[PDB]
Amino acid sequence: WXAXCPA
Amino acid sequence: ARNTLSSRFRRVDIDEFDENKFVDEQEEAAAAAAEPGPDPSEVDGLLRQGDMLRAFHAALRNSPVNTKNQAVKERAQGVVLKVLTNFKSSEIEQAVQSLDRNGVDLLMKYIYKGFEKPTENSSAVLLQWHEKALAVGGLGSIIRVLTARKTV
Amino acid sequence: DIAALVVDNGSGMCKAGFAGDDAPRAVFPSIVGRPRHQGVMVGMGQKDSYVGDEAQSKRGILTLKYPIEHGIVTNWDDMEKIWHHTFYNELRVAPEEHPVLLTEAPLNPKANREKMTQIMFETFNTPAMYVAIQAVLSLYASGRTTGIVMDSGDGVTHTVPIYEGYALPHAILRLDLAGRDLTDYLMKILTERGYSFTTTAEREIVRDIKEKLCYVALDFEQEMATAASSSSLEKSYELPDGQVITIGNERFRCPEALFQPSFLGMESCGIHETTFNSIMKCDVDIRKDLYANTVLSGGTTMYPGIADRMQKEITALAPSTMKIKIIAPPERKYSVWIGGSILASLSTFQQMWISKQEYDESGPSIVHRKCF
Amino acid sequence: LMKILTERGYSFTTTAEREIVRDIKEKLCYVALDFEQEMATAASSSSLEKSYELPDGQVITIGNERFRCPEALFQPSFLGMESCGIHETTFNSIMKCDVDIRKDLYANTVLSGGTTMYPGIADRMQKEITALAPSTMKIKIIAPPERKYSVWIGGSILASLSTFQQMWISKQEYDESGPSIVHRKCF
Amino acid sequence: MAYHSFLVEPISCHAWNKDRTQIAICPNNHEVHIYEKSGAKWTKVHELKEHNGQVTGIDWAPESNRIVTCGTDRNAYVWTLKGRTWKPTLVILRINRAARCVRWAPNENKFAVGSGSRVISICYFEQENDWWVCKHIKKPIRSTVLSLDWHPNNVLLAAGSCDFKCRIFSAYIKEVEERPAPTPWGSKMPFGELMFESSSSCGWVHGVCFSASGSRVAWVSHDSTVCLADADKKMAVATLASETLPLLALTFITDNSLVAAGHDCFPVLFTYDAAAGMLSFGGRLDVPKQSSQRGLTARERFQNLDKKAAGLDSLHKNSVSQISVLSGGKAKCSQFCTTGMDGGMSIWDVKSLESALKDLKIK
Amino acid sequence: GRLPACVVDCGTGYTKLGYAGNTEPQFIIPSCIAIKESAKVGDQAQRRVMKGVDDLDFFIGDEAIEKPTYATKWPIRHGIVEDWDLMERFMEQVIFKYLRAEPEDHYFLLTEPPLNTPENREYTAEIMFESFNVPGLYIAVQAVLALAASWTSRQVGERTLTGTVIDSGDGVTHVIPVAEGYVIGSCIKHIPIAGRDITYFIQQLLRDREVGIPPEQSLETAKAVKERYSYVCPDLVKEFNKYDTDGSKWIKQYTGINAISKKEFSIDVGYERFLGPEIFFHPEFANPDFTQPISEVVDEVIQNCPIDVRRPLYKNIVLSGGSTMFRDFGRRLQRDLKRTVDARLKLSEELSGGRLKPKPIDVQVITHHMQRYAVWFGGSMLASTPEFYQVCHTKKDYEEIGPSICRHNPVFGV
Amino acid sequence: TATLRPYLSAVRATLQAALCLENFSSQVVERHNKPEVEVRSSKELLLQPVTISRNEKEKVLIEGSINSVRVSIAVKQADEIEKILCHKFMRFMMMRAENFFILRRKPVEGYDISFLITNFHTEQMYKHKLVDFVIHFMEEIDKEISEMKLSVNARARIVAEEFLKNF
Amino acid sequence: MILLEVNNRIIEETLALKFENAAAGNKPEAVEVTFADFDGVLYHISNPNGDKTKVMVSISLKFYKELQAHGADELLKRVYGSFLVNPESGYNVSLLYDLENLPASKDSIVHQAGMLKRNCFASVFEKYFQFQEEGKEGENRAVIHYRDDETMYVESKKDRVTVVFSTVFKDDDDVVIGKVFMQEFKEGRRASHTAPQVLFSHREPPLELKDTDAAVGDNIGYITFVLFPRHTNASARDNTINLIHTFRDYLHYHIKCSKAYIHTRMRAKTSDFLKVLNRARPDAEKKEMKTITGKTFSSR
Ligand SMILES: Nc1ncnc2c1ncn2[C@@H]1O[C@H](COP(=O)(O)OP(=O)(O)O)[C@@H](O)[C@H]1O
Ligand SMILES: Nc1ncnc2c1ncn2[C@@H]1O[C@H](COP(=O)(O)OP(=O)(O)O)[C@@H](O)[C@H]1O
Ligand SMILES: [Mg+2]
Ligand SMILES: [Mg+2]
C-alpha cells in the first residue's frame, strides 16, 4: 500500500 | 571536382527499347478464342444450395489459364477465392484429397493469388488451404506456381 | 479456434490459459530473478533477467523478487515482464489476437486496475479485456449461484457473499494474510530447531516445505500436547544439498496462524471469524443459504483437514440449527482460473468486454464503469 | 621430502640437489588411500621400498617416505602449518556457496596442476570428501590425464574465441592510463 | 562405388577420359584440374591455366585425347597432350557473351558450344590453315543455351535453353563428314534446321539427353517436370510432374530408364513405358544414409557457444549439377558419376543400387 | 526571432563549442568522456547496456580528466569517430549542459576531416536529425574554415580568398588549397600523422632514457615536454652534435608534480626537443607507411591545382591547428618550399634555352593570432551569414530523403 | 510462437521452393555476374513474385530468379511506439550488412526489412541454415520489439521517480 | 547528469575571466558575446557604448509582459542591488558590472549572475508564494508564457498553489515518446513520502483553464502540480521554484536521452541476431595464424 502496510 | 558538361544522355534507358529482348509468346488459338473461365452464377447457386464440394469443383472446372484478358482472370480469381475462404476449417482436407495433381497445382496458384489482396479473415483460411495443399502436392506445386508464365 | 485468454495472475503463482478448457495451459511462479554476481566464462548465457520456472531452476545465483505483494502490484517493470513471458514464452500466442480476462482481489486500489487496463491496451494492444473479481470466478467454477466464497489466495484472503447472482458489495471482507505471510512465519519459527533460512532461494525451500509437510490442527492445544508428549508427529525433509531436517511441533503451527493472527502480531481475527462476520453482514433472510454453501478456494486452503477445522469453528460460532457445509472441491487450487475459462466462454458475456475503441474514447478510467 | 630423507641417511642440502629430490618425488611418491594402514604395512614388510639412482651412480632406497611426502597435502600439521588439508579446503569452499548449487558442485569437482598427478589422489580426494558431504550427494572427481597442462589448455581455448578480441588491453589504452588499467579490464 | 570430395567450393563441370582413369574438374575458378586415379586415392596430375574467367564447360574426347574448355571469357580452348604437358589451341567463337556448355561430337570431328549470346557454335578444324573455325545456329533461339547432347549419328544436336524450350537442331557440317542417313526426326537436314521444338512454356531446361539409339530425347525442367519426346510415335511427348525440387542433370542408363538428379542431392530413377507413352517415377536410387554424430570437445564446444550461441541424408550435401556415364554406354549402363556444388564426386553403381533396394526395378 | 546557430568543432584532442556570431569559442574542452567501466566479460555491444538510469552517469571535457575512479575514453581517433555510443553521449552533454541549447531552435555546423567516410556523415545526420531533431545541419571540412581566420591579423587590402591551408590537429594533418573561394577538393591531402603521434614518440623517447616519471602520467608529461621545450631544427645530425658537444646548454630540465603524493619529479629534456616536430619533415619516425615530408606534400598539392592559380597559392600558405605552433615551423617549411620552387624555376629556364628569367615565385607561410582555434572562428563566420541558412540540410530534406542527404563532400566527384 | 505457426510454415515452404539457385553470367553485359532480381535486366530469368500474408499488414514478398532471391518482410507494427522502434531496429540491422551476408542495406519500398540471397550464399553457406535464420527472425522480431517497448516504459518510470523524488 | 542545472556556464565563465583580468591589474579588453539558453532565452554580454570598463549582461525572455507587472521586480532588485540598470534596447533585463568598483569575494556576484534567468523566473513566481503565505484567498492567478506555444498557469489560494503546464512537443517521435513520458509521471509519487499532487490529462483541459488564455488543444498535455504549504514555505521554495522552472526542459532532455538509451539495446539485439545467422557459415578446416596487424605469422 502507500499508507499503512507496505504494498 | 564536378562535371560542367551535359550528362543528360546517360538518363535515357535504351535497353527498354532493345530488339533482342525476351517477349513471352502466346498461342494463336489461345489469343483468338478466349475462355471465359468458371460460370459465377452456377457457383452462387451451388453455394446457396449449401453443397461445398461441388461448388469447389465447379470453381476449378475451367480457368483462364490460356487467355490474356485481365477482367476474366480477376473475376475467376474472385469466384474461386469466394469458394475457398467460405469452407469450414474441417472439410478442407476432404476437398483437397478429391483433386488430381493438376487440380492441386492450380489450387496452389489460386491460393498464392489470394494472399496479395487479403481481407479480415481471408488469409487465415488461405493458410490452412496452403497447409493441406502442400501436404498433398509438396514443394513441386509451389515451384509450378513460381515458374508459371501466366497468372491465375 | 480464436478464444479469449484467461490469465489468473495471482500474487504468488501466475496461471494462464485459453478460454474453454478445464485446466490452465501454463502455471509458473510469478517471480523475477536477476543475477547478483559477475560472469567470468565467455559466451555462457549472459542475459539480463530470468522469469518463471527458469528463475526457480537457477535460483542459486539470482535474487528473486515478487512483483505482486498482498494482491497489489508494487513493481510494474516486473509485472510487464511477467505478462510478456506469459504471452510470448508460455502460451506462445500473439497478445493482440485474443481478448484477455484478468483477475483482481476485491477492495484494491483503483490505480491497480487502471494501470492494468493501461498496460493491456497501450503496451500489448489487446482488442478487448476485462478485470473480474476472483471470488466471483471461484463461485462460477463451483457451479452454483449462491454462497460465500472464501478465497484464501496465497497473497491475500477475501470473502465475497453472493445470493442468486447478486453480489453484496457491502459484505465483502479482505484480510491481508495468506501463503507468503505463513512462509515468513515458518522461516521465523524454524530457527527454534536451529535451521536458519535467510535468503530468497531459501524462502523457496521453505515454501516447498510448507506446501508438503504442514497441516492444520483440528484442535490446537490437543495437538500441541500430543507433539510435546510423544515424538510420533515429526517429519523429515531433505534440502537440495543432502541435509536432512526433522520438523515436529512446527508442522501445525504455521497454518494455525490463519486462525490466530495474534501469532503474527496482528490485531485481526482468524479466517473463520472473518467468514462468519462476512455472513452476519448480510441480511438475515438469506444467511441460511450462505451457511450451507461456504466455498473454499486458493492454494492456501489445500492444507489437509482445513475443511474440518473451518466447519468446527463456524458451527461453534453460528447458531445450532443451521446446516454448515464447507464446499471444498479437491481441485480448488485452480478454481479461480476454472471459472474464468467458463465466464470468458459464455455467449451472454461477449457484450461485456472493454473494447479497444471504448478505451480510446473514455481513457483508462472506463474499467470502473464496465468491470464491477 | 628433503627434510624426511635425512632420517633414512641421505642428505640433500644444496639448491642443485633440490632438483634431484623433485625428480625422486615426481617419479616415486604417491598418495596412500588409507594413511595409517599404509604406514603399518610399509613398516611391517619391505614391499613398498623403491630404489632410485642418483646422477653419479649411487642408488638410494626409500620406503615409508614415498607416501609421507604427498600426505602433507591432506594434513599440513606435518609442515607445522595450521591450515586445513586440500580436501577440507575444497569442502569448505563448496560449503561457502549457496545451498541450491552445492549438489551441482559436488558432481563437478575438477583437479589440475602438476601437483595433482600423484598416483591415487583422485580416489583419496573422493574418499575424503564423501566423508564430509551428506550421504546422498554424489561426489565426482573429474581428473583428466592431461591435468598438468589444463591451465594452459583452457588459455588457448580462451584466446582463440571471437569475443575475446574485445577484452584485450590494447597498447594504446595503456599508453594513456598506466598500469592501473589491469584492475579495470581484467578481474 | 565411393564418394570423394575434391574441394569445398562447387565443381562447375567434369570430364573423364576413355579408360576412366583421369578426371578433369573445375575448382570454381579459371583453372582446370586433372586428377588421376592412383589405387584408392586421387592425386592431381595437371593444372591447365589459360582462361580469364571461370570455366563452365569441359569435355574430354576419348579416342583422340583432346580436352575442350569453354569459360565466361567468351573463349574456347582445345588442349592436346604434348609429351607431358597440355598445350592449348584457341578457338574463335565470335560470341559477345559468356559461354555456358561444350560437347564433343561422337566422332570427335567437331564440338558444340552453347553460349549466353543466344547462339550455338559448331566448331570444327581447318587443316588447310590449322584453323579452328565455327558456324552459328541462332534462328529459333531466344536465350542462353544451357545443355547439349549429340545424336549418335553425329549430326543432330539436342539443346535446352532458358526460353523454356527444348530443341533438336541439325549440326551437319558439310566439310568434315558425309550427308547423314534419314532418321525418324526428319529427312531434310541442312545446317541450322529445326527438327523438334517442345511445347513447354514454363521453367528453364537444365538438361537434355538423347537415347542410346537416338530415337528418344529426354529433358528436365526447372518446372520440376521430366519429359521425354519419342520420335517413332510422331514425336509424342510424355511428361511427369514431380513433387520435389527441380532437376539439373539426367542420363540414359538403358533405352527405357533415366537417372536424374538435382536440387534434392540424391539420384532418382524414372522409367518409360512405350506401350502406353507415359513416364513412371521409378523411385529414389540412393538409400538414405544415417550420418554418424560426433561428441564435441571443450575447444569446439566453447568455439560454437561463443560464435553461434547434417540435415541431408545423401552423399552430396549440395545440389547435383552434372551426371555422366562412366562405363557401359547408354544402352546398358553400370556406373554413373555425379558432381555437384559441394565439390564432391560420387561414383555410383547400378548393380549395387539395384541390390540394396528390392522395390527398385529398372525397365 | 532567430537564435544564433550552434558551432561544435569536434577534433580528436580538443572540442570547441560556441554560438555563431562571436569571436572565439565559448568552450574548449578535451574530447574525452569519463564513464564507469569495470571488469566484465563479453562483447562491447553487450557490456554497454546499463540498467536503469546508469547510462547518464558520465562526464565530458575538463570534468572527465579529474575523475580518478572513472574510465576515460576518447571516442574520436584520427579525426574519424570510432565509437558512436560515446559520441552520442558526448554530443548530448555538449548540447544540454555546456551550450544549453534547445536543439530544435538552432542550426548546427559540425566539422570533419577530408577523408571522413560517408557512413560517418550518415550516422552524424541520423544522430542530429532523429535524436536531437535539429532544424538544419551543415558538415563543413575543417581546414577550409581555417582560411577565414587569418584576415583578423593581416593589414587591410591584402586579405585574399586564395591560399593553401595546412591544418595539423591532434589526430590528422590535412592540406587544402582554396582558390577564389572554391575548395579545390581533388587536390586535398590527408595524413593521419599529427600531434598525438608526436606525444607517443616523445613518451617512448622519455621512457627509454629517463627514470622517475610516474606511469599514470607518462603521457601527461610527454605533452608538457612537447608543448614547451620543442622547436624545429634546420639540420638533424648537426643538432645531435650540438647536443653532444655542449650538452650543458641544450639539455633542459622539466619539473613536474606526482599527483598522488604531491612530490616533485625532475627529468632531463634532451633530444626530444627537436625529434618531436621532426616527424613532420620525416613522417617515418612515427608511421613507417608514410615517407614524404610536409614541404613535398604541400608542393604536390599546389602543383596539382590549375596553372594560373599556382602563383597565388604559394603566396598565402596559412597554417592552422595546434601542432603548427612549433618555433620556426613556418620558417623551415618556407625554406624547403623556396628551395624546391627555385630549383624547378631554374630547371625550366635552362630547358627554355636561357633567354627569359621568370619572376621568382613568392613563398610565404602565414602565422596568425587565431591558429589554436582557427577552424572554429571560421565556422563562426560561415554560420553567422544569411546564406548559411540556404546551404544547410533542412529537417524536411532529411524527413524526405533520409540520412543519405549528408553523403557528399568536396573531396570526390559525382 | 503458436499464432504464427501456419504463416511461418507457408513462408518456409515457399522459401525452399525458391532458393534453388544456379550460377549464371549476365546476358546484357559482357562479363558481369550480377544478381538477376536486383538488375531486372532480363524478364525470362525472373519467377513470379509470391506474397504470403497473415493479415492485411504482415506479409512476406518473395521474388525469385535464376541466381538470386529477394525476401522482403513487412512486420507487425501495432501503434506509433512500435513503429518507431521497428524503424530504428531495422536500421541498426542494416548498419551491419556485411556481417549479415544475406542482408540488404536498404529495404524494398513498402517493406520493413529485405534479404538478398544470391547463389554464392547458397554455395558457400548452408542453405537450410539461411532458411532457419529468416524464419527465426520472423518468429522473434515481434517479441524483441515488445521488450524494447517495455524497456521504454521502464525508462519513463525511472525518470519520473528521479524527478519527483527531489521535491 | 540527471537533473538539469539552473546556472548558465557561459555567463559565469566570461564574468569570472573578466574579473580575474581586472583584479590582476591588466587593462580591460573588449567583450561582445551573444548566446542563448533554454525556452528561447537570449543573452548578450557587451560593453555600453564601447566603454571597455563596464560590462553589461542583458537577457531577453518569453514572459515579457508578466515581468513588467507591478511587483515582479522585488526579487531581482533584492538580489542584484545596484547592478540592476535599465534594459538594453531590444532586451528585457540588464545588469551592469563596473570593473573598477567590484567588491571583494568576486565568486558570489558571478554565482548570482549565472542564475539571471532563474532569478527573472523566480521573481515573477514568488508573487503567488507570497499571496499564499499572507493568508489571502482569491489572489491574482496568471499564465506565464514561458515558451512560445506552451504555457504555465499559476494560481494562488488560501492553502495551496496550483501550477498547470500546458505542454506540447515539436517533433513526431518526441510527441510519441512524450505521451509515454507524461502518462508515466504519476508513478513518481511512489519514490517519496512527500511529493506534490500531480495530475495528468490529455482528453480535456482542467477546470482551471476555462476563464483564461492558457494554450489548449487536442495535441496538448496538461500536468497539474498542487504545491502545498510544505513545498512553498520560506525554507523549501528555492528547490520548488528550481524544479517547477526546469520541469519542461528536464522532460525534453530525458526524452532525447531515451533514444540514445534504446540504441544500446538495439545494438545488443542486432549482435544476438548475428549470432543466430553465424550458424550458417560452415566452420573452416584450417585457418592461417596471423599477427595483431594481420600479416602472415612468419613462424610456426
Ligand atoms: N497443498 C498445499 N498445502 C499448503 N500450502 C500450499 C499448498 N499448495 C500451495 N500452497 C501455498 O499456497 C500458495 C498457492 O496459492 P495459489 O493458488 O498459487 O494463489 P496465488 O495465485 O495467489 O499464488 C503458495 O504460496 C503455496 O506455497
Ligand atoms: N603550443 C603547442 N605546441 C605544440 N603542440 C601543441 C601546442 N598546442 C597544442 N598542441 C598539440 O595539438 C593538439 C591539440 O591541438 P588541436 O588543434 O586542438 O587539435 P584537435 O583540434 O584535433 O584536437 C594536441 O595533441 C597538443 O599536444
Ligand atoms: Mg489465486
Ligand atoms: Mg582540429
Numbering used by the authors:
A (entry chain l): 1 to 7
B (entry chain G): 2 to 153
C (entry chain R): 4 to 375
D (entry chain P): 189 to 375
E (entry chain C): 1 to 309, 319 to 372
F (entry chain A): 3 to 416
G (entry chain F): 2 to 168
H (entry chain D): 1 to 300
Task: Quote the passages of the study that discuss this structure, keeping the authors' original sentences.
Regulation of the assembly and turnover of branched actin filament networks nucleated by the Arp2/3 complex is essential during many cellular processes, including cell migration and membrane trafficking. The actin-binding protein cortactin, which is considered a class 2 NPF, plays a crucial part in stabilizing actin branches. It interacts with the Arp2/3 complex and actin filaments through its amino-terminal acidic domain (NtA) and 6.5 central unstructured 37-amino-acid repeats, respectively, although the molecular basis of these interactions is unclear. Activation of the Arp2/3 complex involves conformational rearrangement of the complex, resulting in the formation of a short-pitch helical F-actin-like template.
To maximize the number of branches in our sample, therefore increasing the possibility of visualizing the hitherto elusive binding site of cortactin, we used the most active isoform of human Arp2/3 (Arp2/3-C1B-C5L33) and included capping protein in our sample to limit daughter-filament growth. The resulting cryogenic electron microscopy (cryo-EM) structure of cortactin-stabilized Arp2/3 actin branches had an overall resolution of approximately 3.3 Å, allowing us to visualize cortactin. This structure showed that, unexpectedly, cortactin connects the activated Arp2/3 complex and the daughter filament, in contrast to previous proposals suggesting that cortactin binds to the mother filament. No density corresponding to cortactin is observed on the ADP-bound mother filament (consisting of MA1–MA6 in our image-processing scheme). Both mother and daughter filaments adopt canonical ADP-F-actin structures, and Arp2 and Arp3 are also bound to ADP. Cortactin NtA domain residues 21–79 form electrostatic and hydrophobic interactions with all four Arp3 subdomains, as well as contacting ArpC2. At residue 55, the NtA domain turns by approximately 90° on the surface of Arp3 and forms an amphipathic α-helix (residues I55–T76), which binds in a hydrophobic cleft on Arp3 and points towards the daughter filament. Further, the loop within Arp3 (residues 155–164) that follows the hinge helix—which we now term the cortactin loop—makes contacts with the cortactin NtA α-helix through a distinct conformation compared with branch structures in the absence of cortactin. The first cortactin central repeat (residues 80–116) extends longitudinally by approximately 5.5 nm from the C terminus of the NtA α-helix on the daughter filament, bridging across the two successive subunits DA1 and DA3. The interactions between cortactin’s NtA and Arp3 are specific to the activated conformation of Arp3, as computational docking of our NtA structure onto the inactive Arp3 conformation generates structural clashes.
